[PDB]
Amino acid sequence: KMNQFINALMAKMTLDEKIGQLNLPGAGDITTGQASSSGIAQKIKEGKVGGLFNIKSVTKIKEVQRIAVEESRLKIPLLFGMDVIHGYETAFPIPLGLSCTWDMELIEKSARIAAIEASADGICWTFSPMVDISRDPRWGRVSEGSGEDPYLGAQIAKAMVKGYQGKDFSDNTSIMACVKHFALYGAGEAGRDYNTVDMSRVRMYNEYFPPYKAAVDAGVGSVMTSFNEIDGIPATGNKWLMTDVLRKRIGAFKGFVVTDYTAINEMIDHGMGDLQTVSALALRAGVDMDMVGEGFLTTLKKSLQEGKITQAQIDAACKRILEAKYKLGLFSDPYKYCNEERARTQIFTPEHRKIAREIAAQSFVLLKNDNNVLPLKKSGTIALVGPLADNRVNMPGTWSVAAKHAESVSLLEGLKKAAGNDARILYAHGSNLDEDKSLIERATMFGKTLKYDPRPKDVVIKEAVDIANQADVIVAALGESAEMSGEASSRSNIEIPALQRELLQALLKTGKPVVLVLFTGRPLALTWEHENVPAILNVWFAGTEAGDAISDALFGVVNPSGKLSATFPRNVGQVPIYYNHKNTGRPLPEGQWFQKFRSNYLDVPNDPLYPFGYGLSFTKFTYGDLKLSSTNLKGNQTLTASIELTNSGDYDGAEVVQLYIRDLVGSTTRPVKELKGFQKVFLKKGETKTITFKITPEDLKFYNYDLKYDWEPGEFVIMVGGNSRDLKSQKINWLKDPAFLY
Amino acid sequence: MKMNQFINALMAKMTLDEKIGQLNLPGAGDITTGQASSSGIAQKIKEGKVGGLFNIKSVTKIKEVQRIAVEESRLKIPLLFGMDVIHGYETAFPIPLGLSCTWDMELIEKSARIAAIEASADGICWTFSPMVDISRDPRWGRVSEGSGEDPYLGAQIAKAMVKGYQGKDFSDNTSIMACVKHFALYGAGEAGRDYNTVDMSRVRMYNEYFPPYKAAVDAGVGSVMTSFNEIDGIPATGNKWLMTDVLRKRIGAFKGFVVTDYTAINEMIDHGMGDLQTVSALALRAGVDMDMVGEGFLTTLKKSLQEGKITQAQIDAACKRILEAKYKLGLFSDPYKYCNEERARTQIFTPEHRKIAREIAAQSFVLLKNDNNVLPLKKSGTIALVGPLADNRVNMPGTWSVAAKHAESVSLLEGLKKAAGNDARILYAHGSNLDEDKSLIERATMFGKTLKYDPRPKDVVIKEAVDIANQADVIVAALGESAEMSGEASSRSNIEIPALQRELLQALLKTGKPVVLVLFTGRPLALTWEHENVPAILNVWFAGTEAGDAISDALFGVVNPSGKLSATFPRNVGQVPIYYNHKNTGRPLPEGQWFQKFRSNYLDVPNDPLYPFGYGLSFTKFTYGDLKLSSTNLKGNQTLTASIELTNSGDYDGAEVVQLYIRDLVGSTTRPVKELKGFQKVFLKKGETKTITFKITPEDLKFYNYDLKYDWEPGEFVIMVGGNSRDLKSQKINWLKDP
Ligand SMILES: OC[C@H]1O[C@@H](O)[C@H](O)[C@@H](O)[C@@H]1O
Ligand SMILES: OC[C@H]1O[C@@H](O)[C@H](O)[C@@H](O)[C@@H]1O
Ligand SMILES: [Ca+2]
Ligand SMILES: [Ca+2]
């Protein structure tokens, strides 16, 4: 069995060969046809390479793996990793957009399909999911995550891990997952990427940690450290974090820890010392694999000779890496993931694209729909206008490194396809992405270019207005470019670019009904748009099928059913503003802004523009009164909470029913509410269904001042609705059972 | 009969109810002169239910109220009389944030001395001051009451403030008991919204936020006020770790009493902590001694005692602490110590006091830009003064000036005309209201701090000012905030000059005439566009009753501006929180290299603030030589002497604030890129050179490490000296421990 086989392996290994297993270097370019004489080859031959990443194609990966199998002393195969974030070649929506589906079945599926494509191409390990909680729309990496809520985040994290890893690591359709970035990366100060993070231990445990824990408990194979410091120690060298929290219950994690890109080396910049010092710190902390920086490879032996680390520390890190490869099936078949036929037939198939088209349409959030503007009639003339109206490579959004960007369906493309002979579609650019070309340049890196019009904005705006005047309705494709979010894409301004707002205004001024189809990787400040635009559909970035999926929604093929996973502020002045907040000692009563001497601003209401969980539909949903099985409970009983949901509008549709719980009094202050459950239900027009939730004390537990995980006896409010804001509710009392106090 | 014996003897005579009554600091209700003894508050005092009262004004009223306790209560225990004396009593000095920019501890202390003198002369023996909350968030209206973002400068000002109020003896009739607030961390409210949640690590508290409070305590501050915010999920007012284990940690004993903020106990109910009895008991157990307004102590402590939820010892200890403050202030030898009509007649708002305020105000201004020798203005030709803040008295003292003679302040128009005389013609024009949106103007001008409002269309009023401006040789635009746009519960999600005023400024610039922006504000503002387009910018904060004269002294060059920012001025609110003493991060952006993908930086704004901590210009120029160090290799408890030649290389006499920064390069935890560790304000005649010297020891190197241990670690440091936290001369050293 595994344990005997790996001890046997390690018994044959030299110190340098163990150290080598901990190395995850950059590959450098590898000339197809002479991989065995390439730069990386020599290091593989000497047993200095544990794995590689962002190598693409089974053909290339196969020949690189051959070097390790045929030309290294012990023939230890490599891991091959990659950033498979929201799909391999078929792009699903960016993670933040996927979160708004609130559909854990759909989400697990997208991961499943992504792992089927990657594994068919020699990839056996993905750097996903990223489950960083964040309350800061300025941070470009909000797009990679799933919002501000620990519960929803935890559910999604589970779905993602289950999707990738499947039923068994050794399946050639399952890949190993890597939860990132441990930890607290989403609280970087001032929303500036990589910036200082600081918070209390109790906040960590209640507000930020749960998603990481769900990934571990779901059996995630690996964990990736984060770039930020915590309590003044970078995550990568933080022993409390990587050892005391991550591996507390011994048998709990069991996987291995990889650093983020040169995160060890960067501890030098942080102010922790030289490369040897920070490398040793990382190993003692519980880090097992060193990404790109080679601090482990170059300094571990010296540190050992110097007594700064121990043999057992090296052996334990090496063991974990081998155990990963063993689980993935690599020792019984180093080429398990290398089949030319799978790669030809199981990637970017018509079936896969179709599923992505279906999923994408379920992620859209309908933020406004006045006067039945949507769905559009498929008749007359429709004017599509804006810098995002006819572009392919931006549709998949950021973190789509293996995506077929150029085969993506543009919005103009999908609209003409949908309209057919029944409606005429007119196009106009309207305006560039921004007035500042240098901003455009840096916002469109990595080949994600937008066609640029050199003419004066007024000329181009007038052009679009003339076209629009010839149409009956106007569809405005505005927002961000794909690379305005993602890594190192922080924005101090979270509005739609000014130039585009000037365009939008000129369109509204035509008197034509306007639909704002919004492309973004983050929450945006949209008060003015909400005030003036008849309809607003948030499409995030929908993937390779964006144009088709969006057209499904626009014409009413699919009834929008998405709901916000993060709060949209009125202005960046409100940040951070989130749903699960404390009451403060001077709360502003609802509807009373402005009140002197309450907690509020002089110049903006306390409320965000759209709250967590917000999402409209083409139809309407009516909630009956909240039914509770009991208002007086004791010990480990089960509370049943039920409610009637009725489709009272004009169309078939789905709605997300949300359960919130409030702990009224506590030994510490409790959030005014916390998401604790949800169910997505489809209803025929006029149909009524009884939705039921089962609450137990487990749902009432929190981390107290002493970090004890428990619930306290007292009153609670149980809330249910399609919003963190609009809810039916009922108070209950829950007591302890003296007999069972252990 | 020393204090301890007397207090013990007294408490032996008191009923439980009388001990509890000493813990009560209620709101007074209206009190009709000539019938105080039959007024609303009178019955409570007679029953012994009142330990103190606050915000009552005038020695006449206070003597009479004190007479109720002295003559009509069973034990004749006199009352404390407190007030918010924040930046002056009737004579108003600049707001504290403004004052902090003087970087002149003597002036800070003197301003507090004059305040104590005035307040004590009018019956006040206790001020709710200094406010020493560290803040990195300019949205927070209360930044105006503090001293900026730096623990060191903050700690220095705290000492200066406490000494100024308290003197060397609590029993002097010119000294009043100070009260450090708001313990603690109040300045980190989320999203800059007053009273909002606070959260942070212990190590950040100790290094970045706690030092000013500790300084006040070590300076001997007589009392401490709790804060409205929670910490680790527990409101400060009910937080035993904070109020006992930190505040009264054995060594460094705080010996004074703790008073809650305004109904802070009752608000713990809203926080989510329980009912009034529960939260009251929590507060007493935490170490709270006096209960402001909410009467939780008064109405619930006995019941808790009966139920064994609190102890007699806890009540006794609190009562004793209150009685000790009264004793120290001399109230048991003379209950009317602070009640002398003649003092109040001769020692308040005197011509001398007003002169001192004028001098101190002028030294608090920060010159943020001065291109092409626009300032100082020549006292000739014609000068146009335009803006919503050009001719208004009541706003000049700014916020937190409840006792100030607002209506007697010197408006900028007034002060200018006076200094001009027959040498220069001052023209005036309104230009614009404070803001479009009247309803915002209204909530921003509460408490009787009203501005003249012009019903005419904005374009009309602008054309009026432009036509006046076009007749002058220079325009002086008085723009910015109103007084109550900052202060308590005055948070702004937008920290620019109000748009209407900027549209006015644009119009004034377009005349082609040189424009000087005289900026009124209680907070750092985002001023990028203004910095790019306005020739000269003078930040005058809120200068107090003498605003007009002090500002004219600067404009004409009577006084050469010498202030330095104590808080960072961001490029936009999207950069917040942005501060000088920050960590390096693992991916720092090299200086001058914005923008770099995969470095710690924004797509749409540079990393740099607009004006950094310690920034401030002069009418003259200062040149620093090279930094001279006595040694670059130190061992144990040696003294390092750092010296530098400073030269007044400009055209005017003037002072500059020489600043000392230190960087600990490597730590067991990450260390800030720099921390202020010393400063000196020095005056230099035109062309004069002086050797400025600092003396550094390991105490200057210490910090709280991961385990909260206060100590220094051996290794390399950078020593930096300059007039600014960004423009520095530096030299690296090695400091080792010894066996
Ligand atoms: O590409 C490997 C890693 O690069 C890092 O810069 C990112 O922060 C990670 O999310 C990514 O997985
Ligand atoms: O007026 C008494 C107290 O009122 C409170 O609302 C403020 O926060 C304190 O600074 C002030 O001293
Ligand atoms: Ca409870
Ligand atoms: Ca050091």
In the numeric block, the tokens 């008064």 are attached to B298
Q: Does A3 touch chain B (CB under 8 A)?
A: no
> Strand A621-623 and strand A639-647: pairing?
antiparallel
d(CA B598, CA A442): 12
Neighbouring C-beta atoms of residue B352, cutoff 10 Å? 10
Residue owning tokens 């061992």 = B635
Q: Which domains does chain B have, with CATH numbers?
A: 1-349 (3.20.20.300), 350-621 (3.40.50.1700), 622-739 (2.60.40.10)
A387 exposure class (CB count in 10 Å sphere: 0-12, 13-18, 19+): buried
Bridge partners of residue A199, in order along the sequence: none
Annotated active-site positions of B, please? 261
Min Cα distance B185 → chain A (Å) is 13
Q: Do residues B121 and B59 lie in contact, with contact meaning Cβ atoms separated by under 8 Å?
A: yes
Ligand nearest to the CA of B85: 2
Tell me how far apart the alpha carbons of residues B514 and B382 are, in angstroms, rounded to a whole number. 12
Question: Residue B365 corresponds to which tokens in the numbers above?
Answer: 């201004």
Match 């707002």 to its residue by tokens.
Answer: A501
Q: How far apart are CA A338 and CA B589, in angstroms?
A: 41
A350 three-class SS: helix
Q: What is the rounded (10 degree) CA torsion for B382, B386, B391, B392?
A: -160
Give the integer Cα–Cα distance in Å for A592 and A600. Answer: 10
Quickly list DSSP for A185-231.
GGG-GGG-TT------HHHIIIIISHHHHHHHHTT-SEEEE-SSEET
Terminus-to-terminus CA distance in chain A, angstroms? 39
Contacts of B69 (CB under 8 A, 6+ apart): B45, B50, B76, B77, B78, B79, B335
Contact B499, B409 (CB under 8 A): no
d(CA A386, CA A429): 5
Cα(B499) to ligand 3 centroid in Å equals 47
Chain B: residue nearest A264 by CA?
B586
Listed residue (A485, A467, A494) closest to A386, CA to CA: A467
Q: Which residues, including other chains, have CB under 8 Å from residue B717's CB and lie 6 or more apart?
A: B662, B663, B664, B665, B701, B732, B733, B734, B735
A461 φ/ψ sector (left φ>0, alpha ψ -120 to 50, else beta): alpha
Residue among B402, B256, B436, B298 nearest B16 (CA): B298
| Catalytically annotated residue among A260, A288, A390, A548 | A260
Contact yes or no for A271 and B584 at CB 8 A? yes
Nearest to B385 by CA among B411, B359, B421: B411
Which residue's CA lies nearest to atom 5 of ligand 2? Answer: B262
Calpha distance A484→A491 (Å, rounded): 8
Terminal Cα distance for chain B, rounded = 52
**Contact criterion met (CB below 8 Å) for A206 and A154:** no
Cis-peptide into B577, omega within 30 deg: yes
| A186 contact partners, CB below 8 Å, separation of at least 6 | A132, A133, A134, A135, A136, A139, A141, A142, A145, A208
> Per residue in A83-119, is it b (16+ CB within 10 Å) or e — as a string?
bbbbbbbbbbbbbbbbbbbbbbebbbbbbbbbbbbbb
Supply the DSSP string of A133-166, one letter for each residue: ----TTSGGGGGS--S-HHHHHHHHHHHHHHHH-
Within chain A, what is the greatest distance between any pair of CA atoms? Answer: 80
Tell me the two tokens of residue A448: 């994600």
* Closest-lying ligand 2 atom to the alpha carbon of residue B227: 8
Chain B CB contacts of A585 under 8 Å are 195, 228-230, 235, 264, 267-268, 270-271
Residues of B in contact with A259 (CB under 8 A): none
**Subunit contact A586:B446, Cβ cutoff 8 A:** no
Amino acid at B207: N
Q: Which of B200, B203, B434, B604 to mutate to test the interface with A (most CBs of A within 10 A)?
A: B604
Give the full edge-to-edge strand order of the sheet including A222-225. A178-182, A222-225, A256-258
Q: Which residues pair with B407 in a beta bridge?
A: none
A187: tokens are 């609280």
Which of B114, B726, B94 shows the shortest CA–CA distance to B365? B94
Structure tokens belonging to residue A502: 């000037």
What is the DSSP secondary structure assignment for residue A245, as one 8-state letter?
A: I
Contact present, B376 and B559 (Cβ < 8 Å): no
Give the separation between CA A577 and CA B193, rounded to whole angstroms. Answer: 10
* B 177-206 residues with CB < 8 A to A: 190-197, 199-204
* Nearest bound ligand to the CA of residue B223: 2
> CB-based contacts of B101: which residues, under 8 Å, 6+ apart?
B364, B365, B366, B541, B563, B564, B565, B566, B616
Nearest CA in chain B to A606: B193
From B38, B40, B53, B45, select the one nearest B76 (Cα to Cα): B45
Q: Starting from the CA of residue A292, give the closest ligand.
A: 1
Closest C-alpha among B338, B331, B326, B333 to residue B22: B326
Q: Taking a C-beta distance cutoff of 8 angstroms, is the pair B371, B416 a contact?
A: no
Residue B500 has a CB neighbour count (10 Å cut-off) of: 21
Q: How far is CA B716 from the centre of its chain?
A: 35
Cβ-based contacts under 8 A for chains A and B: 237
| Residue whose structure tokens are 């003409």 | A416
Q: Report which of A193, A137, A135 is spatially closest to residue A571, judged by C-alpha positions.
A: A137
Q: Which of A256, A286, A136 is nearest to A196 (CA)?
A: A136
On chain B, the residues whose CB falls within 8 A of the CB of A229 are 583, 585-586, 669-670
Tell whether A377 lies on the interface with B, counting CB pairs under 8 A.
no
The Cα–Cα gap between A79 and A77 comes to 7
Q: Which residues contact B335 (CB under 8 A, 6 or more apart)?
A: B66, B69, B70, B76, B78
Pair A512, A470: CB distance under 8 Å: no
A260 is catalytic: yes
> Are B63 and B336 a contacting pair, CB within 8 Å?
yes
Q: Which atom of ligand 1 is nearest to the CA of A83?
A: 12
Please report residues of A whose CB lies closer than 8 A to that of B488.
Answer: 597
Alpha helices in A1-101 (DSSP H): 2-12, 15-21, 39-45, 58-71, 95-99
SS (H, E, C) A177-198: CEEEEECCHHHCHHHCCCCCCC
Contact B370, B514 (CB under 8 A): no
Distance of CA B162 to the CA centre of its chain: 13
Pairwise CA distance, residues B551 & A654, whole Å? 65
Minimum CA distance residue for ligand 1 atom 2: A261
For A601, which of B193, B587, B669 is closest by C-beta distance?
B193
Distance CA B201, CA A189 (A): 14
What one-character-per-residue DSSP string does B156-183 give? HHHHHHHHHHHTT-TTSTT--B-EEEEE
Q: Are strands A79-82 and A51-53 parallel, antiparallel or unpaired?
A: parallel
Q: Give CA–CA dist B103/A334, Å, rounded.
A: 69
Phi, psi values for residue A599, rounded to 5°: -80, 95
Q: Which two tokens stand for residue A618?
A: 């083409």
Q: Are A389 and A412 in contact (CB under 8 A)?
A: yes
For CA atoms A148, A154, A156, A161, the dihedral sign is: positive
Closest to A41 measured CA to CA, from A69, A67, A61? A67
Residue A691 forms beta bridges with which residues? A643
The answer to whether A589 faces chain B, any CB pair under 8 Å, is no
> DSSP per residue over A37-58, as a string?
GSHHHHHHHTT--SEEES---H
User: Quick check: B571 contacting A, CB < 8 Å?
Assistant: yes
- The A residues from 36 to 75 touching B (CB cutoff 8 Å) are none
The count of other CB atoms within 10 Å of the CB of residue B179 is 26
SS3 B623: strand
d(CA B412, CA B406): 14
CA atoms within 13 A of residue B629's CA, in its CB half-sphere: 20
Classified as helix, coil or strand, A236 is helix
Contacts of B485 in chain A (CB under 8 A): 602
Radius of gyration, alpha carbons of chain A: 27
Q: Provide CB contacts within 8 A for A394, sequence distance 6+.
A: A388, A405, A444, A448, A450, A481, A482, A519, A541
Query: d(Cα B282, Cα A380) in Å, to the nearest integer?
Result: 70
- Cβ B489 vs Cβ A600: under 8 Å: yes
d(Cα A303, Cα B260) in Å, to the nearest integer?
55
User: What's B406's DSSP letter?
Assistant: G
- Closest C-alpha to B374, from B617, B541, B726: B617
CA A731 to chain centre: 34
Instruction: Count, in order, helices (H) and strands (E) of chain A.
Output: 22, 27
Instruction: Extract the tokens encoding A103.
Output: 């559909």
The answer to whether the CB of A157 falls within 8 A of the CB of A501 is: no
A155 CA: distance to closest CA in chain B (Å): 26
d(CA B451, CA B439): 13
Residues across chain B: 739
Q: CB of A244 within 8 Å of any CB in chain B?
A: no
- Whether B191 and A574 lie within 8 Å, measured CB to CB: yes
Strand pairing category for A233-234 and A229-230 = antiparallel
Spell out the SS3 assignment of B272-304.
Answer: CCCCHHHHHHHHHHHCCCEEECCCHHHHHHHHH
Instruction: Kindly provide the residue ranges of all beta strands, DSSP E only, lying in B540-625, ordered along the sequence.
Output: 622-624
How far, in Å, CA of A506 to CA of A462, rounded?
8
Determine the Cα–Cα distance for residues A185 and A238; give it in Å rounded to an integer. 14
User: What are the DSSP E strand ranges found in A488-623?
Assistant: 514-519, 535-538, 621-623
**Ligand 1 site, residue A260, Cβ cutoff 6 A:** yes
Tokens matching residue B583: 């960590």
Out of A198, A582, A601, name the one closest to residue B200 (CB): A198
The contacts of residue B298 (CB under 8 Å, 6+ apart) are B20, B21, B23, B24, B26, B49, B291
In DSSP notation, A656-719 reads: EEEEEEEE-S-SS---S-EEEEEEEEEE-TT-EEEEEEEE-GGGG-EE-TT--EE--SEEEEEE
Burial class (CB in 10 A: 0-12, 13-18, 19+), A504: buried
Q: Where are the alpha helices (DSSP H) in A509-595?
A: 527-532, 546-555
Among the partner-chain residues B195, B199, B603, the one whose CB lies closest to the CB of A489 is: B603
Angle, vertex CA A418, rays to CA A416 and CA A422, nearest 5: 85
Chain A residues closer than 8 Å to B204 by CB: 198
Task: Give helix A210-217 / helix A150-165 axis angle, nearest 10°.
Answer: 30
SS3 B398: coil
Q: Which residues are registered as beta bridge partners of A694? A: A640
- HEC per residue, B2-65: CHHHHHHHHHHHCCHHHHHHCCEECCCCCCCCCCHHHCCCHHHHHCCCCCEEECCCCHHHHHHH
Give the separation between CA A544 and CA A552, rounded to whole angstroms. Answer: 14
Distance of alpha carbon A566 from alpha carbon A186, whole angstroms: 13
Categorise residue A319: left if φ over 0, alpha if ψ from -120 to 50, beta otherwise. Answer: alpha
C-alpha B323 chain-centroid distance: 29
Ligand 1 atom closest to A128 (CA): 12
Report which of A232, A276, A231, A279 is spatially closest to residue A259, judged by C-alpha positions.
A279
Tell me whether residues A202 and B233 touch, CB distance under 8 A.
Answer: yes
A733: left (phi over 0), alpha (psi -120 to 50) or beta: beta
Beta strands (DSSP E) in A300-371 are: 365-369
Residue showing tokens 């225990």:
B77
Phi-psi region of A520 (alpha: psi -120 to 50; beta: other; left: phi over 0): beta
Q: Which residues pair with B646 in a beta bridge?
A: B624, B690
Number of H helices, E strands in chain B: 22, 27
Whether residue A573 contacts residue B573, with contact meaning beta carbons closer than 8 Å, is answered with yes
Residues 6+ apart with CB under 8 A from B4: none
DSSP string, B339-389: --HHHHHHSSS-HHHHHHHHHHHHTT-EEEEEGGG-PSPPSSSEEEEESTT
